[PDB]
Write a protein that binds this ligand. Structure first.
Ligand SMILES: C=C1C[C@]23C[C@@]1(O)CC[C@H]2[C@@]12C=C[C@H](O)[C@@](C)(C(=O)O1)[C@H]2[C@@H]3C(=O)O
Length: 154
């Protein structure tokens, strides 16, 4: 049933800094990284592990939705893997019936890190809508990761 797309990016920042930003500090880092997109992010419930509930509030007028609620579905500190599944809003209002993003961080050297991006998705329509193809949604993820790199290196 579930379709999967993978890509990779390499960022010139170290593993621990990236992993902290993407996990325990996500709610304060994301608005600083994406100040023209994300107004704020809250932890609704949970400690950061599986089943933690997050809400991302967006600036209106950019996308067809002004929030997304996410739930953590994987949290592995040894492999530095975190998965976020959309619960409400987000791409569920744009043509998909299921969406999840999983990041896995691997050190290349002290200040260079490989980021694997896995996008899992489904849609009810016989043909997928263009704006929610993973080739397109991954572009936004890569935009974010590059902005995260820029934020951490400052
Ligand atoms: C530019 C982006 C990329 C977002 C969607 C957004 O439009 C704004 C917020 C990004 C993001 C930030 C943190 C998480 O990595 C993510 C999966 C999410 O929920 O929100 C990230 C998410 C994504 O990678 O799909």
């Amino acid at each position: 049933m579930i379709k999967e797309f993978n890509t990779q990016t390499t960022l010139n920042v170290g593993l621990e800094a990236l992993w902290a930003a993407q996990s325990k500090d996500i709610t304060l880092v994301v608005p600083k990284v994406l100040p023209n997109i994300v107004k704020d992010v809250q932890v609704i419930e949970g400690d950061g592990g599986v089943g933690t509930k997050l809400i991302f509030n967006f600036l209106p007028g950019i996308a067809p939705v002004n929030y997304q609620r996410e739930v953590i579905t994987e949290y592995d500190e040894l492999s530095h893997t975190i998965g976020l599944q959309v619960v409400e809003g987000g791409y569920l209002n744009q043509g998909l019936s299921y969406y999840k993003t999983t990041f896995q961080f691997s050190a290349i050297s002290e200040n260079k890190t490989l980021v694997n991006v896995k996008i899992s998705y489904d849609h009810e329509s016989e043909l997928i809508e263009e704006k929610v193809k993973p080739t397109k949604t991954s572009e936004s993820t890569l935009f974010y990761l590059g902005q995260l790199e820029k934020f951490l290196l400052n």
